[PDB]
Structure 1
């Protein structure tokens, strides 16, 4: 049997390397890889499905999963998963599992994951009289610390993050709303408004740069590495550069909660495996995904990517700060929540982006902005 697999993974990233190993097996299945190019995974992929030309297997960005699953494009793998001795749903973090779920059925298997958390400069904490062993755990503590850490004389903002008018702004904002008891289907609760007002306060009180509105997570975190922001909300992808560039002692803690007993959340990036529904070789496609999952234990070591799984430890990385950071990130992943899952996620995300921009620019109040977003979202998902 010959299978086809499409992914954005580059030559040194997991998919093509896993494919080479799978093909080397004595198992009568062979996979041919197509490397998808930037920004095309979704467009090319539902073009291909509509014309009967989809691959057998795809690695799809998690917020896109529900669109394919709800429209019949992905194979229902519920029973296959149940029978598998390799793929066990209890191994996975809850958020990634939810992203492959539609209508009480599994339509894929998580491939990898990431999240965001709160980096902090322990040396600037000490200079401000803050105990570096006790980083902020609530939104109020976070704002208090950001104030104490802001230092115009030395061009330091207390915090950096991203509210960019792209997917990153929604990615960063949604967990705050979720911790306050809101969802994408209900994004204008007074709790969600409090989240957005908190962001507005950070900007208006000069505790976060105005460039928060236009800057990527990566570019925001560069300012933390340079010592111009005392805290940063970003992901595990930052660590190696931070080790090279940040000339200070630093730690990482979970994204703070609005009140001590509030449910935790954070953002959730990266991809899922899926089988296209008209594959002529469903059993063999599933066996390939089982093989990939069986190697999740080696993913971080080999590729520097985190499995979507709670049963796999992060191996020692050779650096103590990196180990501690990743300890926090894997704890955070217990609480990471998906965007959606919604077949109309792109439209919904744009509505939320427009609300963030409208509020933080002062064009609309936070409540007026989120009321407008909720109205748009109710047309398409509820």
Structure 2
């Protein structure tokens, strides 16, 4: 056999290792060895691997990081193999995910999946609070007020869970709030972004969200919602299949609340892309693996609760009512997602935003000063 190696963050529950086991069972003369990426310095580790000759054949890379690798020659130009393939057609893909694998008029990967974040809510806790579980909050004011009502320390319940972690988690979570209020990563210090960050300060200062929001991932925050310790959670569709098993209450999912009545919806485009490292010894076989993964996209939601990056395969209902309502909400919120970049310097942009969030939420800097600082850094890097 040709043996390939593949790196991804995906858990044993999530697509990559399962798709690999299925692929390997084909006995087609190619075998894939999986390694789950550890430690949250994926980008630097993977570039260092590439530079030293330790890179895998295939990686699932977060979409905002793609351009850094593509621009630096680390990824194989798959333009011609995509063209030749009938399994992978660029016309099948949503435009934002497709653009994220592109650099200088070439394709340097194939989208794996797409997502964004939305607002999960525990309908049983809404009901017990005297709220209307059919009417979740629509505006930031409503969201904060609901969170105040639902915060019940005597019962170990925070009103909301989210992530402000000093890595991509925090940037991905914060950008929707800034964007809805009129800002972007290219202009992150508008009055509306300050209001967004003041709103996050309210959630922490008033103890409506755990202090651990400053250091905890979206996945680990949402575990607290699933256990009944947070009444609402901002997270993505990657939570659904675990939530169905773990949450022992009735729940819904709605669009992210907007800053003033009828202000616009917005959020950041999530999820990963497949890529082949440029010095692979097995380019054709690596690409055939990716073709196999793409051929399973039609089953991704039903099997993993994740969403393909494709307009050719609109996602059908599963038959599970909670999951199917979640699907509706995420498909709707996805219509408002915006790309982080393209930028070969995304990590530096994101670090500036992370530091602003940490500075304001810790009380070390005012929200205005924190975001002004970020905007000056971003001007230089971007």
TM-score (norm 1): 0.83
Q: 1:369 to 1:91 in 2, by over 3 A?
A: same
Q: What is the rounded CA distance, in whole Å, between the counterparts of 1:220 and 1:125 in structure 2? A: 19
Spell out, residue by residue over 1:287-336, the C-alpha distance to the aligned partner (whole angstroms, 9 max, x if none).
Answer: 44233212211234444543223443545556322232233223333333
CA contact (8 A) 1:95 1:335 kept: no
CA-CA distance at 1:17 after TM superposition = 5.0
Spell out, residue by residue over 1:52-89, the C-alpha distance to the aligned partner (whole angstroms, 9 max, x if none).
Answer: 55444332232321110121222333455455433334
Q: 1:180 to 1:94 in 2, by over 3 A?
A: farther
Spell out, residue by residue over 1:129-161, the C-alpha distance to the aligned partner (whole angstroms, 9 max, x if none).
Answer: 433222222223322332343445655433222
CA-CA distance at 1:173 after TM superposition = 0.7
TM-score (norm 2): 0.83
Q: 1:309 to 1:260 in 2, by over 3 A?
A: farther
Q: Which ranges in structure 1 are unaligned for 5 or more consecutive residues?
A: none
1:115 is aligned to 2:116: yes
Q: What is the rounded CA distance, in whole Å, between the counterparts of 1:70 and 1:38 in structure 2? A: 24
CA contact (8 A) 2:64 2:340 kept: yes
Spell out, residue by residue over 1:88-127, the C-alpha distance to the aligned partner (whole angstroms, 9 max, x if none).
Answer: 3443344433432334543211112343210112233334
CA contact (8 A) 2:237 2:306 kept: no
Q: 1:365 to 1:43 in 2, by over 3 A?
A: closer
CA contact (8 A) 1:124 1:149 kept: yes
Q: What is the rounded CA distance, in whole Å, between the counterparts of 1:8 and 1:131 in structure 2? A: 38
1:167 matched to which residue of 2? Answer: 168
Q: 1:199 to 1:7 in 2, by over 3 A?
A: closer
Q: 1:18 to 1:155 in 2, by over 3 A?
A: closer
Q: 1:16 to 1:168 in 2, by over 3 A?
A: closer
Q: What is the rounded CA distance, in whole Å, between the counterparts of 2:7 and 2:260 in structure 1? A: 43
SS at match of 1:328: helix
CA-CA distance at 1:366 after TM superposition = 0.8
Q: What is the rounded CA distance, in whole Å, between the counterparts of 2:230 and 2:22 in structure 1? A: 44
2:256 matched to which residue of 1? Answer: 255
CA contact (8 A) 2:240 2:305 kept: no
SS at match of 1:113: coil
Q: Pick which of 184-193 and 309-318 moved more.
A: 309-318
Q: 1:302 to 1:2 in 2, by over 3 A?
A: same
Q: What is the rounded CA distance, in whole Å, between the counterparts of 2:32 and 2:213 in structure 1? A: 43
Aligned residues: 381
CA contact (8 A) 1:12 1:303 kept: yes
Q: 1:8 to 1:150 in 2, by over 3 A?
A: closer
2:361 matched to which residue of 1? Answer: 360
Q: What is the rounded CA distance, in whole Å, between the counterparts of 1:292 and 1:319 in structure 2? A: 25
Give structure 1 regions of 4+ aligned residues with deviation exceeding 6 angstroms: 23-30
Q: What is the rounded CA distance, in whole Å, between the counterparts of 2:164 and 2:20 in structure 1? A: 37
Q: 1:76 to 1:145 in 2, by over 3 A?
A: same
SS at match of 2:318: coil
Q: What is the rounded CA distance, in whole Å, between the counterparts of 2:280 and 2:219 in structure 1? A: 38
